[PDB]
Design a binder for this molecule. Sequence first.
Ligand SMILES: *[C@@H]1O[C@H](CO)[C@@H](O[C@@H]2O[C@H](CO)[C@@H](O[C@@H]3O[C@H](CO[C@H]4O[C@H](CO)[C@@H](O)[C@H](O)[C@@H]4O)[C@@H](O)[C@H](O[C@H]4O[C@H](CO)[C@@H](O)[C@H](O)[C@@H]4O[C@H]4O[C@H](CO)[C@@H](O)[C@H](O)[C@@H]4O[C@H]4O[C@H](CO)[C@@H](O)[C@H](O)[C@@H]4O)[C@@H]3O)[C@H](O)[C@H]2NC(C)=O)[C@H](O)[C@H]1NC(C)=O
Ligand SMILES: *[C@@H]1O[C@H](CO)[C@@H](O[C@@H]2O[C@H](CO)[C@@H](O[C@@H]3O[C@H](CO[C@H]4O[C@H](CO)[C@@H](O)[C@H](O)[C@@H]4O)[C@@H](O)[C@H](O[C@H]4O[C@H](CO)[C@@H](O)[C@H](O)[C@@H]4O[C@H]4O[C@H](CO)[C@@H](O)[C@H](O)[C@@H]4O[C@H]4O[C@H](CO)[C@@H](O)[C@H](O)[C@@H]4O)[C@@H]3O)[C@H](O)[C@H]2NC(C)=O)[C@H](O)[C@H]1NC(C)=O
Ligand SMILES: *[C@@H]1O[C@H](CO)[C@@H](O[C@@H]2O[C@H](CO)[C@@H](O[C@@H]3O[C@H](CO[C@H]4O[C@H](CO)[C@@H](O)[C@H](O)[C@@H]4O)[C@@H](O)[C@H](O[C@H]4O[C@H](CO)[C@@H](O)[C@H](O)[C@@H]4O[C@H]4O[C@H](CO)[C@@H](O)[C@H](O)[C@@H]4O[C@H]4O[C@H](CO)[C@@H](O)[C@H](O)[C@@H]4O)[C@@H]3O)[C@H](O)[C@H]2NC(C)=O)[C@H](O)[C@H]1NC(C)=O
Ligand SMILES: *[C@@H]1O[C@H](CO)[C@@H](O[C@@H]2O[C@H](CO)[C@@H](O[C@@H]3O[C@H](CO[C@H]4O[C@H](CO)[C@@H](O)[C@H](O)[C@@H]4O)[C@@H](O)[C@H](O[C@H]4O[C@H](CO)[C@@H](O)[C@H](O)[C@@H]4O[C@H]4O[C@H](CO)[C@@H](O)[C@H](O)[C@@H]4O[C@H]4O[C@H](CO)[C@@H](O)[C@H](O)[C@@H]4O)[C@@H]3O)[C@H](O)[C@H]2NC(C)=O)[C@H](O)[C@H]1NC(C)=O
Ligand code: EQP
Ligand code: EQP
Ligand code: EQP
Ligand code: EQP
Ligand code: NAG
Ligand code: NAG
Ligand code: NAG
Ligand code: NAG
Ligand code: NAG
Ligand code: CA
Ligand code: CA
Ligand code: CA
Ligand code: CA
Lengths: 388, 388, 388, 388
Amino acid sequence: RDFNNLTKGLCTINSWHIYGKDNAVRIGEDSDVLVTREPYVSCDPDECRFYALSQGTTIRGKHSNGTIHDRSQYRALISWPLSSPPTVYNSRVECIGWSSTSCHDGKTRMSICISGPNNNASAVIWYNRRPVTEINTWARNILRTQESECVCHNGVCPVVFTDGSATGPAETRIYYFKEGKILKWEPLAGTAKHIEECSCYGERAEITCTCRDNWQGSNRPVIRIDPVAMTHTSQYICSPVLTDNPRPNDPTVGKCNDPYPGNNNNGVKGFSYLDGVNTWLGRTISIALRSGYEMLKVPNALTDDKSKPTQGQTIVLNTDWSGYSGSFMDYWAEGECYRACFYVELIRGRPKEDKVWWTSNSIVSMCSSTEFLGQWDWPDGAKIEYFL
Amino acid sequence: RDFNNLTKGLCTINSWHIYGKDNAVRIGEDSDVLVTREPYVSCDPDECRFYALSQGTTIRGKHSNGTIHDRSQYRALISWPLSSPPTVYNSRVECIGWSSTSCHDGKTRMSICISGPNNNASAVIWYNRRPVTEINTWARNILRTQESECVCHNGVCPVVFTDGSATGPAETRIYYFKEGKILKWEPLAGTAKHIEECSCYGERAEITCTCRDNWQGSNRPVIRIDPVAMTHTSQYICSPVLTDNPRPNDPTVGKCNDPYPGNNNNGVKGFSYLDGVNTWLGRTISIALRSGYEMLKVPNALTDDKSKPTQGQTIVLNTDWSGYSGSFMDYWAEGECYRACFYVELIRGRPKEDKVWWTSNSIVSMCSSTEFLGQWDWPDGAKIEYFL
Amino acid sequence: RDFNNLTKGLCTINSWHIYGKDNAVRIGEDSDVLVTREPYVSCDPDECRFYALSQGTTIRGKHSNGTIHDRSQYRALISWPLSSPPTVYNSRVECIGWSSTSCHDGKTRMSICISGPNNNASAVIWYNRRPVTEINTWARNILRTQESECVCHNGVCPVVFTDGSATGPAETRIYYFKEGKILKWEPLAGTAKHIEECSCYGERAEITCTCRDNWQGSNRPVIRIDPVAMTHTSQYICSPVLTDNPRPNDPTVGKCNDPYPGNNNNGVKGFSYLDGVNTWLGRTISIALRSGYEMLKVPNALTDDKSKPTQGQTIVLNTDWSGYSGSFMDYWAEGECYRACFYVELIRGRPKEDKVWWTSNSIVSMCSSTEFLGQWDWPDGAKIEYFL
Amino acid sequence: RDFNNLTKGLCTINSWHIYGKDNAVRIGEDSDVLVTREPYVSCDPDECRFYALSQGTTIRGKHSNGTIHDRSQYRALISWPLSSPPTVYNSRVECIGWSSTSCHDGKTRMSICISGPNNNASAVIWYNRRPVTEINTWARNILRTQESECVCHNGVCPVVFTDGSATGPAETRIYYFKEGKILKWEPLAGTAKHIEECSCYGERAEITCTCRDNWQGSNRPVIRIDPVAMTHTSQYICSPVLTDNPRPNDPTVGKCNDPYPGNNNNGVKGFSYLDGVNTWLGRTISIALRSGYEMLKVPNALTDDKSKPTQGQTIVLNTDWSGYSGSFMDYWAEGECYRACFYVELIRGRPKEDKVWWTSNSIVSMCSSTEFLGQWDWPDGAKIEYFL
Ligand SMILES: *[C@@H]1O[C@H](CO)[C@@H](O[C@@H]2O[C@H](CO)[C@@H](O[C@@H]3O[C@H](CO[C@H]4O[C@H](CO)[C@@H](O)[C@H](O)[C@@H]4O)[C@@H](O)[C@H](O[C@H]4O[C@H](CO)[C@@H](O)[C@H](O)[C@@H]4O[C@H]4O[C@H](CO)[C@@H](O)[C@H](O)[C@@H]4O[C@H]4O[C@H](CO)[C@@H](O)[C@H](O)[C@@H]4O)[C@@H]3O)[C@H](O)[C@H]2NC(C)=O)[C@H](O)[C@H]1NC(C)=O
Ligand SMILES: *[C@@H]1O[C@H](CO)[C@@H](O[C@@H]2O[C@H](CO)[C@@H](O[C@@H]3O[C@H](CO[C@H]4O[C@H](CO)[C@@H](O)[C@H](O)[C@@H]4O)[C@@H](O)[C@H](O[C@H]4O[C@H](CO)[C@@H](O)[C@H](O)[C@@H]4O[C@H]4O[C@H](CO)[C@@H](O)[C@H](O)[C@@H]4O[C@H]4O[C@H](CO)[C@@H](O)[C@H](O)[C@@H]4O)[C@@H]3O)[C@H](O)[C@H]2NC(C)=O)[C@H](O)[C@H]1NC(C)=O
Ligand SMILES: *[C@@H]1O[C@H](CO)[C@@H](O[C@@H]2O[C@H](CO)[C@@H](O[C@@H]3O[C@H](CO[C@H]4O[C@H](CO)[C@@H](O)[C@H](O)[C@@H]4O)[C@@H](O)[C@H](O[C@H]4O[C@H](CO)[C@@H](O)[C@H](O)[C@@H]4O[C@H]4O[C@H](CO)[C@@H](O)[C@H](O)[C@@H]4O[C@H]4O[C@H](CO)[C@@H](O)[C@H](O)[C@@H]4O)[C@@H]3O)[C@H](O)[C@H]2NC(C)=O)[C@H](O)[C@H]1NC(C)=O
Ligand SMILES: *[C@@H]1O[C@H](CO)[C@@H](O[C@@H]2O[C@H](CO)[C@@H](O[C@@H]3O[C@H](CO[C@H]4O[C@H](CO)[C@@H](O)[C@H](O)[C@@H]4O)[C@@H](O)[C@H](O[C@H]4O[C@H](CO)[C@@H](O)[C@H](O)[C@@H]4O[C@H]4O[C@H](CO)[C@@H](O)[C@H](O)[C@@H]4O[C@H]4O[C@H](CO)[C@@H](O)[C@H](O)[C@@H]4O)[C@@H]3O)[C@H](O)[C@H]2NC(C)=O)[C@H](O)[C@H]1NC(C)=O
Ligand SMILES: CC(=O)N[C@H]1[C@H]([C@H](O)[C@H](O)CO)O[C@H](P(=O)(O)O)C[C@@H]1O
Ligand SMILES: CC(=O)N[C@H]1[C@H]([C@H](O)[C@H](O)CO)O[C@H](P(=O)(O)O)C[C@@H]1O
Ligand SMILES: CC(=O)N[C@H]1[C@H]([C@H](O)[C@H](O)CO)O[C@H](P(=O)(O)O)C[C@@H]1O
Ligand SMILES: CC(=O)N[C@H]1[C@H]([C@H](O)[C@H](O)CO)O[C@H](P(=O)(O)O)C[C@@H]1O
Ligand SMILES: *[C@@H]1O[C@H](CO)[C@@H](O)[C@H](O)[C@H]1NC(C)=O
Ligand SMILES: *[C@@H]1O[C@H](CO)[C@@H](O)[C@H](O)[C@H]1NC(C)=O
Ligand SMILES: *[C@@H]1O[C@H](CO)[C@@H](O)[C@H](O)[C@H]1NC(C)=O
Ligand SMILES: *[C@@H]1O[C@H](CO)[C@@H](O)[C@H](O)[C@H]1NC(C)=O
Ligand SMILES: *[C@@H]1O[C@H](CO)[C@@H](O)[C@H](O)[C@H]1NC(C)=O
Ligand SMILES: [Ca+2]
Ligand SMILES: [Ca+2]
Ligand SMILES: [Ca+2]
Ligand SMILES: [Ca+2]
């Protein structure tokens, strides 16, 4: 009907309640479920769906041997109904590619998939389910994107891309689209040294994305965008409570405009909600590998380089695997504020579970509450040995 | 369009005709059917669906070993099309939890799921498919609810919860919701000593729920609610025709405001239609275990402590298993009265059938007729030995 | 929108073209297809669907052993999309029973299912998907109905039932319904001695049903109904070209008001289009068993007891099995006349193919053309030995 | 709503981007996917679907042994959702036959299927999903059609048929339909000697179809139609860059009105976009067999018998199988021109891969871009040995 505008603010978060859960690997043991990875959730004005990058095979199927690789001609962006598994018979294909992003603007939805060789990949922008715009590689080394949903304000929806090295300086750019057409684009600015896999949300005409520095830096990069003026800035989260993985241990003071040193050439997609005292950071529990997941209330994290934990909540125990995590919100829900949500990818199989030749994932999703609810941990459930 | 109001009365019941049947366990032998339990039926203005608490696995699947437990992170409230099985590809998820209730109000539908540990569980109320309200545990010992549908009158829909011991005094409360928001709540009143798993229906601006006393008492508790004034009372069904399971034998006189003694720490979810001479009680045939099912016309049951059977009808033979049973009606059907219906859960597997490692169920459903129709028995059908 | 009226006449038939085909048994070898029997086709204002009486099991499933029986608590009336198989995931249940009929009236659809023991069965009438009317057994010996679709004229839809013996005198009645309510009913009249499984169609405010005499009589009974006056008559098709199965050989002259003698206690559901010179009778090729199928132009069959074949067309070869057959037409298609159609059930398995423990069927359907098209035979396709 | 008119022109093509991909054979290894062949794509005003001629069996199913044959009573025209596999549970049947074509006109869609024996086949035309017109064989030797979609202009949609010999002179005719009714038909004209499997598109009130000469001729026949006047002409593509398969090698000069000699009794369905300098021809890489696929910019191909390659792009490598290819466009997309698309069938199994007893295919589809995007090759993916 009409373009949506970020008119409200974030509700206060005093705890988190379960929103959705897949149980995909448990069910996939005896069903026609698709091997996926790199998921997310995204809302429309009438329903919210689950999203993922398919591998073009069922888990129990023979072609699942070798699904440890990321880029192939047999991947695609698919969507399915909330808390149901990525079934072969109930899934809908958005576009063909091995990297992606998607978002609705009040009128219709825009989806972007990237495909191709390393020497020269390319992005195609779709809108109202028709292919509208195309963009070829600029720095000729794996053109990539968010891996989670974008946000729009009155028709304009910014998106972040990177093209170039993963263990050194790259070429990041913020593009501004309106009905699938490029309005403008500008290169990265600010003090952030490496950008990758941005997780974004919005409130009161502003967009905040917490991203990943894969080069060096256990603290996380941040990008604030102004959808009306079409401008931005970047920096790091000051707080000493580090959130990348892998990472060293938490210190007494942190860094605001420089990567905190300790581990190289590695990271993980993550997110956070930056709102003064109402600030919460998410992270794995293990400093060495992707296991466990926890949420932490760290007042004034982004601006205070000494801030420490006030309250917290456990999502997945440290004996249980996790993976990626990102942000989303239901911009079309009734209320006076925006209720914040997030998802956590639960990876099974290789590399850590190598008696199996595949790699796949599960999903758990939570949203905020204004009460102080009790906590419980939410693992995937599957017994790898039933697959031997 | 507009809120629904309990404007009619109950039609006269002279017999029951089949409404719906699943045949889930028969079909699940060679299909992708989900292991479920604790079912019910619920109507919308345009279609009536089947409901159940999934276990997150298919019957023939490996993860079905151990589905004898009730509370787990892998259960969910699902719905599917009438007289079809709970298939993996045709099911819709309402919310995440191990206890529940749901009902439409004329405009939209409200669903409630409860999840968490025993020390501290919590309920989340959803409306129009978005999470609106949250409630944490009050007495810190398994917060639980109806296990069947609620009833609404002009926007207000009462719901009964219990939190605390199952073999002693607990904390029951009636909550009044309007569009997912808590209007009010009040503690139990009247002479009923223990409340659990209420089965409710409505006619002429009043709501009657026949429940379960798991502490002591083979006779059943009753709760009458006034949706307009937001008040209630409780008591027991006077009649000597006992209906809980397990239970002792029928006596000559019964108890109106006190639990009839005989068996402890056990019961089963049940229901009844209380309407003077037009009164019918349902019950298993075996006094010791959940087998067989029969309907009995006992005039003035609730107020007469000597009332005895006038007419009856067999639903499931005593050589056949049954389980839970509850009430529902199609508030949007054409006519001058409300045609009363009920469902019976048919459990297969453990505990009684232990050559199998799972536990699942089937459904049969009937509604009333004004004629005196012939009777037939309706078992599940499956041969356990085809699963060995 | 508005009630439909039989306003047109039959187009001239000069040949038949394929309309639809299932290929169910071929596909069911490696799919979740349901064991069915007693099928038919029925149109709505917007789509035409396939219909059948399910057995509550998949073909490859264990519970298919013993599906040679007809009456059981696990059967149901289901419908699915045209030329697709009766799949477990794509089927819709109309009502519970082992005998049936259904038809749309311009506004909504009425469906009727019969269930129960032999001593006392009962029919429930549904309308707009809600159970409206009930009727108990009158002569206490297997109450049964059409096994194909009914026809309506301005809201009124007659239906034929039988209750009593199959090898002697019974109790037939024509019921007249309007929105699921009984308008009237009257007993059989005319010179027909035994009625069973009527196949009906309509044009110019009249309804003709060709039925089955299971007692004695290789020639077929006929019932003409006047939907406006609510009256009828019966008789036999005069022509010497006999069409029941089993049957003796064709003679030189036939019988108009008396069963032609030759074979007892046996028959098969069939049909015909009676329209003067534009008359066509259908029948199996073998006089002893259900094999092959052919259509024959026999001018003035119903009134001329000497009429013989003018033109013909082969549908299924005599080396291929067939079974039941019935009539249907698309009352909502554009044109100035009614294009006539029919279906043939193709049975596989027991009794003739006994290396398998089940019994199931396939469907082929044809409609008329005004040209003289070429012919081809349409078998089921499946190789029974792939099931061993 | 209203009839569609070819009002725009072709956008300029500077490269091709992926549109859709099936991955059917990879997935069919562990799923209920249907054995198909002879596919295509076709758009509606609201969605574009995939099309194919089914064989009436699943790939892993027993009835897949022998699917090397083309004409049988068990084939059908089916359609399914874009980039999803032809699943047994998600497919929709259009009509019954072993040869076909289909297209939407702005209001509704017309589909045509051909069935029957070689002595006398026949076509039935369907519209708005009801059978409207019938046509019997004229030259009594396999009546056949396009095997891809038709194009319409203000209600009129021409279609090309052939009936008669494949290795000598036949009887081709162009039919003009309007709402399923034959407006007119006329025999082939111009200098083309043999016509088969036409691939058509349209822009600015004209229809161009590049077809197949199976008799003699490695260069391709062309038919230009005037939808308003209902007339046409034929000829060959002049250019020396030959595109049929099998074929001899490319010469220095070509033939405009005569079949270029070299190989007999063989060909393959193909297409091309003829637009002056903006001209592109598609073809397999191997001159002997169906392997590899490439697109070539050959300015003024149709009129210049010396034209040679200016630019090109690889679609499938020569070590990978291909098959048929055809044209389609989204006539209802926003813009000022028509964005051109095409599909390539990827055949697996017999005849070249004979360790398997079946024959099936996969799909890849691309559309044009105005940028110069990078290229990648798109194979089917499946490992035949996982089927042994
Ligand atoms: C039934 O259910 C109810 C329902 O909620 C349960 O109640 C909840 O219990 C939670 C667990 O205790 C609790 O969460 C914790 O909150 C802390 C903050 O509170 C305290 O301090 C503030 C300020 O002084 C006070 O206001 C407050 O009242 C308290 O005093 C957090 O600090 C906790 O986090 C730390 O511990 C966990 C492990 O338990 C770590 O994973 C986490 O990362 C935190 O510790 C690391 O990080 C800090 C920051 O740099 C380091 O200083 C510290 O050394 C740790 O560092 C190591 O670990 C990380 C990760 O391994 C690594 O990178 C680093 O290098 C180091 O190696 C925790 O989040 C809830 O707040 C509580 N509910 C409420 C409402 O408060 C109830 O318990 C159940 N049972 C019953 C009977 O009810
Ligand atoms: C073809 O189909 C037709 C279609 O309907 C068939 O007709 C139907 O047949 C039914 C079965 O007989 C019948 O149902 C019974 O009705 C009784 C009431 O009728 C009589 O009394 C009244 C008042 O005097 C009269 O008006 C009426 O005319 C009759 O005289 C019920 O009382 C029957 O229930 C009792 O028996 C069944 C077992 O058969 C028990 O399961 C049931 O619980 C009842 O008995 C227990 O409970 C009472 C109450 O406390 C006890 O006193 C008694 O001792 C039993 O107690 C033991 O059992 C329970 C459970 O095991 C346990 O807790 C307790 O401790 C004890 O151990 C029964 O319901 C229908 O009414 C009839 N149709 C109609 C319209 O009436 C037809 O038969 C078929 N065949 C043919 C040829 O047509
Ligand atoms: C390529 O395709 C084209 C496309 O159509 C093919 O053309 C079609 O060919 C059909 C087969 O021959 C033909 O159908 C037949 O039509 C007969 C009527 O025509 C003749 O008579 C009339 C009047 O005199 C003339 O107008 C007309 O021109 C002809 O002369 C029917 O009579 C045929 O039916 C009989 O034979 C078949 C077997 O072939 C039986 O199954 C059938 O039941 C009929 O025979 C039995 O019944 C009669 C009636 O009582 C008995 O008298 C007779 O003895 C038989 O009885 C025994 O059998 C039954 C069943 O087994 C049992 O109950 C009984 O007791 C006995 O034991 C037949 O229907 C089409 O009409 C023709 N197309 C057209 C438009 O006409 C073409 O051939 C193909 N090839 C080529 C090169 O084109
Ligand atoms: C990273 O990705 C980027 C993204 O695009 C890559 O860039 C692209 O590279 C493509 C491959 O080289 C290239 O396509 C070729 O274009 C030729 C035309 O260009 C040249 O000539 C014109 C005019 O002079 C100039 O304007 C232009 O600048 C060039 O000089 C085509 O001619 C090419 O086709 C021929 O070769 C291929 C094999 O490679 C054959 O399959 C094809 O059929 C052509 O050759 C046959 O046909 C001709 C015509 O009759 C014959 O003369 C010739 O002998 C061949 O004949 C045999 O073969 C056929 C089939 O086997 C048989 O029937 C016959 O009998 C003979 O036996 C080719 O299409 C793209 O144009 C280029 N992109 C752009 C925008 O240009 C990049 O490379 C990647 N890497 C990096 C680092 O970036
Ligand atoms: C487009 C692409 O290749 N994305 C891949 C990125 C990429 O390698 C890093 O961002 C380094 O640049 O890594 C992740 P992970 O395996 O670390 O879990 C897998 C992704 O699929
Ligand atoms: C929330 C919960 O645990 N519900 C469980 C209740 C509960 O134990 C009783 O109401 C005693 O309080 O019992 C039944 P049942 O096994 O007796 O058939 C299983 C339920 O799932
Ligand atoms: C309601 C019912 O039992 N219908 C059955 C009738 C019935 O026995 C005959 O009409 C004799 O009355 O026969 C057929 P068929 O086996 O002969 O092919 C099977 C039906 O299912
Ligand atoms: C109606 C029909 O039979 N179509 C068949 C045609 C036909 O034989 C040729 O057009 C020669 O006339 O060939 C193809 P292909 O096998 O060559 O790949 C298979 C088709 O199914
Ligand atoms: C998977 O492939 C590897 C080589 O990639 C092979 O050695 C291994 O045995 C395969 N796994 C299975 C289960 O076949
Ligand atoms: C189920 O698990 C138990 C232990 O919980 C084990 O002893 C048993 O053998 C398992 N059943 C099957 C069929 O594997
Ligand atoms: C059918 O006839 C009645 C009068 O006989 C009329 O009201 C009705 O509208 C007619 N049907 C249609 C479709 O108009
Ligand atoms: C089917 O059941 C019969 C008895 O009804 C039994 O003898 C037979 O062996 C069973 N068939 C199969 C395939 O198990
Ligand atoms: C397929 O059929 C042929 C004969 O057509 C037979 O020889 C062959 O063994 C069959 N293939 C399989 C896998 O059974
Ligand atoms: Ca890092
Ligand atoms: Ca009790
Ligand atoms: Ca007979
Ligand atoms: Ca050729």
